[PDB]
């Protein structure tokens, strides 16, 4: 079963995670359509996800990757957002929920910019926004996103939309440029380390 560890605001770990989240906000091409208009989040809590089986499978895959990547995990901390957070923290990332016709195929997608991940909290293109107000820029409803350990191993660099089912032979991830999108094709190559609960904040 999943255990959530509550990080304290005065912990350096809490602070480093919020700072990564706050400092990687950027302007988006869609003018804020999907994720809303904001310059900063209000972080309500940050929780560390602890789950024995998810950790086991992550370690297990880590090893296989390292062997095919000159003994390097090539791990990176990256943001992920999607409507499936609650399932992810209990069951792990599941590539079976990926979509053909994703920009780089049926993978699980991660970003360096927290604001990119925030676009997907309510679905592709922000869906119809929060359940309560149908507002993709809702400043009331709480949102969650993940700050994850991602086993990239040997990344394939892609520069056009390609519909991949799996990383290319000898590879373990795809870094795609339509800003970079980090894509894995196996759920066990990501661990949902930090669960961040937050609101976007209305600019003054
Ligand atoms: O991840 C997917 C693919 C579908 C999916 C989602 C969760 C688990 C497994 C598959 N996403 C979300 C996502 N996409 C990104 C694209 C570029 C950069 C960052 C991100 C991001 O943070 N989230 C697509 C989605 C499809 C349906 C609902 S969200
Ligand atoms: Zn709302």
PDB file of N, CA and C in Angstrom, residues 39-93:
ATOM      1  N   UNK A  39       1.824  33.398 -12.525  1.00  0.00           N
ATOM      2  CA  UNK A  39       3.272  33.572 -12.521  1.00  0.00           C
ATOM      3  C   UNK A  39       3.905  32.750 -11.420  1.00  0.00           C
ATOM      4  N   UNK A  40       3.062  32.136 -10.602  1.00  0.00           N
ATOM      5  CA  UNK A  40       3.511  31.495  -9.386  1.00  0.00           C
ATOM      6  C   UNK A  40       2.395  30.598  -8.870  1.00  0.00           C
ATOM      7  N   UNK A  41       2.765  29.542  -8.152  1.00  0.00           N
ATOM      8  CA  UNK A  41       1.791  28.689  -7.503  1.00  0.00           C
ATOM      9  C   UNK A  41       1.712  29.001  -6.019  1.00  0.00           C
ATOM     10  N   UNK A  42       0.586  28.645  -5.421  1.00  0.00           N
ATOM     11  CA  UNK A  42       0.519  28.513  -3.979  1.00  0.00           C
ATOM     12  C   UNK A  42       0.662  27.036  -3.616  1.00  0.00           C
ATOM     13  N   UNK A  43       1.791  26.646  -3.030  1.00  0.00           N
ATOM     14  CA  UNK A  43       1.989  25.242  -2.679  1.00  0.00           C
ATOM     15  C   UNK A  43       1.339  24.915  -1.343  1.00  0.00           C
ATOM     16  N   UNK A  44       0.378  24.005  -1.384  1.00  0.00           N
ATOM     17  CA  UNK A  44      -0.406  23.658  -0.220  1.00  0.00           C
ATOM     18  C   UNK A  44       0.258  22.568   0.615  1.00  0.00           C
ATOM     19  N   UNK A  45       0.804  21.552  -0.053  1.00  0.00           N
ATOM     20  CA  UNK A  45       1.615  20.556   0.630  1.00  0.00           C
ATOM     21  C   UNK A  45       2.497  19.779  -0.344  1.00  0.00           C
ATOM     22  N   UNK A  46       3.541  19.172   0.191  1.00  0.00           N
ATOM     23  CA  UNK A  46       4.397  18.337  -0.618  1.00  0.00           C
ATOM     24  C   UNK A  46       4.574  17.043   0.136  1.00  0.00           C
ATOM     25  N   UNK A  47       4.240  15.948  -0.537  1.00  0.00           N
ATOM     26  CA  UNK A  47       4.278  14.630   0.066  1.00  0.00           C
ATOM     27  C   UNK A  47       5.208  13.672  -0.695  1.00  0.00           C
ATOM     28  N   UNK A  48       5.973  12.878   0.046  1.00  0.00           N
ATOM     29  CA  UNK A  48       6.833  11.871  -0.568  1.00  0.00           C
ATOM     30  C   UNK A  48       6.067  10.555  -0.662  1.00  0.00           C
ATOM     31  N   UNK A  49       6.028   9.967  -1.854  1.00  0.00           N
ATOM     32  CA  UNK A  49       5.297   8.723  -2.058  1.00  0.00           C
ATOM     33  C   UNK A  49       6.163   7.501  -1.736  1.00  0.00           C
ATOM     34  N   UNK A  50       5.677   6.671  -0.820  1.00  0.00           N
ATOM     35  CA  UNK A  50       6.401   5.471  -0.434  1.00  0.00           C
ATOM     36  C   UNK A  50       5.544   4.246  -0.718  1.00  0.00           C
ATOM     37  N   UNK A  51       6.025   3.407  -1.622  1.00  0.00           N
ATOM     38  CA  UNK A  51       5.306   2.197  -1.972  1.00  0.00           C
ATOM     39  C   UNK A  51       6.301   1.121  -2.356  1.00  0.00           C
ATOM     40  N   UNK A  52       6.312   0.064  -1.553  1.00  0.00           N
ATOM     41  CA  UNK A  52       7.296  -1.008  -1.641  1.00  0.00           C
ATOM     42  C   UNK A  52       7.383  -1.603  -3.044  1.00  0.00           C
ATOM     43  N   UNK A  53       6.237  -1.966  -3.608  1.00  0.00           N
ATOM     44  CA  UNK A  53       6.199  -2.597  -4.922  1.00  0.00           C
ATOM     45  C   UNK A  53       6.606  -1.645  -6.036  1.00  0.00           C
ATOM     46  N   UNK A  54       6.160  -0.395  -5.966  1.00  0.00           N
ATOM     47  CA  UNK A  54       6.547   0.577  -6.978  1.00  0.00           C
ATOM     48  C   UNK A  54       8.045   0.805  -6.936  1.00  0.00           C
ATOM     49  N   UNK A  55       8.597   0.926  -5.730  1.00  0.00           N
ATOM     50  CA  UNK A  55      10.046   1.009  -5.574  1.00  0.00           C
ATOM     51  C   UNK A  55      10.745  -0.240  -6.110  1.00  0.00           C
ATOM     52  N   UNK A  56      10.191  -1.419  -5.841  1.00  0.00           N
ATOM     53  CA  UNK A  56      10.842  -2.666  -6.299  1.00  0.00           C
ATOM     54  C   UNK A  56      10.930  -2.687  -7.827  1.00  0.00           C
ATOM     55  N   UNK A  57       9.812  -2.408  -8.482  1.00  0.00           N
ATOM     56  CA  UNK A  57       9.787  -2.475  -9.936  1.00  0.00           C
ATOM     57  C   UNK A  57      10.665  -1.398 -10.539  1.00  0.00           C
ATOM     58  N   UNK A  58      10.745  -0.260  -9.865  1.00  0.00           N
ATOM     59  CA  UNK A  58      11.607   0.810 -10.346  1.00  0.00           C
ATOM     60  C   UNK A  58      13.078   0.367 -10.277  1.00  0.00           C
ATOM     61  N   UNK A  59      13.470  -0.228  -9.150  1.00  0.00           N
ATOM     62  CA  UNK A  59      14.832  -0.735  -8.993  1.00  0.00           C
ATOM     63  C   UNK A  59      15.108  -1.795 -10.032  1.00  0.00           C
ATOM     64  N   UNK A  60      14.149  -2.691 -10.222  1.00  0.00           N
ATOM     65  CA  UNK A  60      14.335  -3.818 -11.138  1.00  0.00           C
ATOM     66  C   UNK A  60      14.624  -3.338 -12.562  1.00  0.00           C
ATOM     67  N   UNK A  61      13.858  -2.354 -13.010  1.00  0.00           N
ATOM     68  CA  UNK A  61      14.033  -1.786 -14.348  1.00  0.00           C
ATOM     69  C   UNK A  61      15.310  -0.956 -14.452  1.00  0.00           C
ATOM     70  N   UNK A  62      15.603  -0.196 -13.399  1.00  0.00           N
ATOM     71  CA  UNK A  62      16.865   0.539 -13.277  1.00  0.00           C
ATOM     72  C   UNK A  62      18.080  -0.309 -13.661  1.00  0.00           C
ATOM     73  N   UNK A  63      18.117  -1.531 -13.141  1.00  0.00           N
ATOM     74  CA  UNK A  63      19.242  -2.419 -13.378  1.00  0.00           C
ATOM     75  C   UNK A  63      19.391  -2.804 -14.838  1.00  0.00           C
ATOM     76  N   UNK A  64      18.280  -3.192 -15.457  1.00  0.00           N
ATOM     77  CA  UNK A  64      18.272  -3.561 -16.864  1.00  0.00           C
ATOM     78  C   UNK A  64      18.745  -2.403 -17.724  1.00  0.00           C
ATOM     79  N   UNK A  65      18.260  -1.207 -17.405  1.00  0.00           N
ATOM     80  CA  UNK A  65      18.647  -0.023 -18.151  1.00  0.00           C
ATOM     81  C   UNK A  65      20.150   0.215 -18.031  1.00  0.00           C
ATOM     82  N   UNK A  66      20.639   0.288 -16.801  1.00  0.00           N
ATOM     83  CA  UNK A  66      22.059   0.509 -16.560  1.00  0.00           C
ATOM     84  C   UNK A  66      22.929  -0.436 -17.396  1.00  0.00           C
ATOM     85  N   UNK A  67      22.571  -1.715 -17.447  1.00  0.00           N
ATOM     86  CA  UNK A  67      23.355  -2.684 -18.224  1.00  0.00           C
ATOM     87  C   UNK A  67      23.480  -2.333 -19.708  1.00  0.00           C
ATOM     88  N   UNK A  68      22.438  -1.718 -20.260  1.00  0.00           N
ATOM     89  CA  UNK A  68      22.403  -1.372 -21.681  1.00  0.00           C
ATOM     90  C   UNK A  68      22.843   0.062 -21.917  1.00  0.00           C
ATOM     91  N   UNK A  69      23.271   0.723 -20.853  1.00  0.00           N
ATOM     92  CA  UNK A  69      23.669   2.113 -20.955  1.00  0.00           C
ATOM     93  C   UNK A  69      24.979   2.333 -20.215  1.00  0.00           C
ATOM     94  N   UNK A  70      25.928   1.433 -20.466  1.00  0.00           N
ATOM     95  CA  UNK A  70      27.287   1.549 -19.938  1.00  0.00           C
ATOM     96  C   UNK A  70      27.261   1.807 -18.446  1.00  0.00           C
ATOM     97  N   UNK A  71      26.406   1.041 -17.770  1.00  0.00           N
ATOM     98  CA  UNK A  71      26.206   1.088 -16.323  1.00  0.00           C
ATOM     99  C   UNK A  71      25.776   2.444 -15.739  1.00  0.00           C
ATOM    100  N   UNK A  72      25.025   3.216 -16.523  1.00  0.00           N
ATOM    101  CA  UNK A  72      24.447   4.472 -16.034  1.00  0.00           C
ATOM    102  C   UNK A  72      22.926   4.507 -16.137  1.00  0.00           C
ATOM    103  N   UNK A  73      22.267   4.811 -15.023  1.00  0.00           N
ATOM    104  CA  UNK A  73      20.823   5.026 -15.005  1.00  0.00           C
ATOM    105  C   UNK A  73      20.431   6.167 -15.940  1.00  0.00           C
ATOM    106  N   UNK A  74      21.227   7.234 -15.912  1.00  0.00           N
ATOM    107  CA  UNK A  74      20.840   8.513 -16.505  1.00  0.00           C
ATOM    108  C   UNK A  74      19.484   8.982 -15.955  1.00  0.00           C
ATOM    109  N   UNK A  75      19.408   9.114 -14.638  1.00  0.00           N
ATOM    110  CA  UNK A  75      18.164   9.499 -13.996  1.00  0.00           C
ATOM    111  C   UNK A  75      18.011  11.015 -14.012  1.00  0.00           C
ATOM    112  N   UNK A  76      16.771  11.498 -14.132  1.00  0.00           N
ATOM    113  CA  UNK A  76      16.484  12.924 -14.012  1.00  0.00           C
ATOM    114  C   UNK A  76      15.176  13.155 -13.271  1.00  0.00           C
ATOM    115  N   UNK A  77      15.138  14.224 -12.478  1.00  0.00           N
ATOM    116  CA  UNK A  77      13.918  14.642 -11.815  1.00  0.00           C
ATOM    117  C   UNK A  77      13.117  15.499 -12.781  1.00  0.00           C
ATOM    118  N   UNK A  78      11.897  15.069 -13.099  1.00  0.00           N
ATOM    119  CA  UNK A  78      11.072  15.785 -14.061  1.00  0.00           C
ATOM    120  C   UNK A  78       9.631  15.835 -13.601  1.00  0.00           C
ATOM    121  N   UNK A  79       8.921  16.865 -14.048  1.00  0.00           N
ATOM    122  CA  UNK A  79       7.522  17.025 -13.688  1.00  0.00           C
ATOM    123  C   UNK A  79       6.631  16.211 -14.598  1.00  0.00           C
ATOM    124  N   UNK A  80       5.561  15.687 -14.021  1.00  0.00           N
ATOM    125  CA  UNK A  80       4.500  15.084 -14.813  1.00  0.00           C
ATOM    126  C   UNK A  80       3.141  15.546 -14.301  1.00  0.00           C
ATOM    127  N   UNK A  81       2.235  15.879 -15.213  1.00  0.00           N
ATOM    128  CA  UNK A  81       0.853  16.127 -14.841  1.00  0.00           C
ATOM    129  C   UNK A  81      -0.069  15.329 -15.740  1.00  0.00           C
ATOM    130  N   UNK A  82      -1.223  14.929 -15.205  1.00  0.00           N
ATOM    131  CA  UNK A  82      -2.227  14.160 -15.941  1.00  0.00           C
ATOM    132  C   UNK A  82      -3.394  13.938 -14.987  1.00  0.00           C
ATOM    133  N   UNK A  83      -4.555  13.512 -15.511  1.00  0.00           N
ATOM    134  CA  UNK A  83      -5.714  13.293 -14.637  1.00  0.00           C
ATOM    135  C   UNK A  83      -5.612  11.999 -13.839  1.00  0.00           C
ATOM    136  N   UNK A  84      -4.492  11.304 -13.959  1.00  0.00           N
ATOM    137  CA  UNK A  84      -4.363   9.968 -13.386  1.00  0.00           C
ATOM    138  C   UNK A  84      -3.478   9.906 -12.142  1.00  0.00           C
ATOM    139  N   UNK A  85      -3.234  11.056 -11.511  1.00  0.00           N
ATOM    140  CA  UNK A  85      -2.318  11.111 -10.366  1.00  0.00           C
ATOM    141  C   UNK A  85      -2.665  10.084  -9.295  1.00  0.00           C
ATOM    142  N   UNK A  86      -3.932  10.016  -8.907  1.00  0.00           N
ATOM    143  CA  UNK A  86      -4.278   9.104  -7.828  1.00  0.00           C
ATOM    144  C   UNK A  86      -4.012   7.657  -8.169  1.00  0.00           C
ATOM    145  N   UNK A  87      -4.245   7.281  -9.421  1.00  0.00           N
ATOM    146  CA  UNK A  87      -3.905   5.928  -9.841  1.00  0.00           C
ATOM    147  C   UNK A  87      -2.385   5.715  -9.866  1.00  0.00           C
ATOM    148  N   UNK A  88      -1.650   6.695 -10.379  1.00  0.00           N
ATOM    149  CA  UNK A  88      -0.197   6.591 -10.444  1.00  0.00           C
ATOM    150  C   UNK A  88       0.451   6.383  -9.058  1.00  0.00           C
ATOM    151  N   UNK A  89      -0.009   7.097  -8.033  1.00  0.00           N
ATOM    152  CA  UNK A  89       0.637   6.960  -6.722  1.00  0.00           C
ATOM    153  C   UNK A  89       0.291   5.652  -6.011  1.00  0.00           C
ATOM    154  N   UNK A  90      -0.772   4.972  -6.451  1.00  0.00           N
ATOM    155  CA  UNK A  90      -1.155   3.686  -5.856  1.00  0.00           C
ATOM    156  C   UNK A  90      -0.710   2.480  -6.684  1.00  0.00           C
ATOM    157  N   UNK A  91      -0.721   2.621  -8.005  1.00  0.00           N
ATOM    158  CA  UNK A  91      -0.441   1.496  -8.891  1.00  0.00           C
ATOM    159  C   UNK A  91       0.831   1.685  -9.727  1.00  0.00           C
ATOM    160  N   UNK A  92       1.343   2.910  -9.779  1.00  0.00           N
ATOM    161  CA  UNK A  92       2.530   3.199 -10.564  1.00  0.00           C
ATOM    162  C   UNK A  92       2.115   3.717 -11.927  1.00  0.00           C
ATOM    163  N   UNK A  93       3.056   4.309 -12.650  1.00  0.00           N
ATOM    164  CA  UNK A  93       2.805   4.747 -14.018  1.00  0.00           C
ATOM    165  C   UNK A  93       2.492   3.540 -14.904  1.00  0.00           C
TER     166      UNK A  93
END
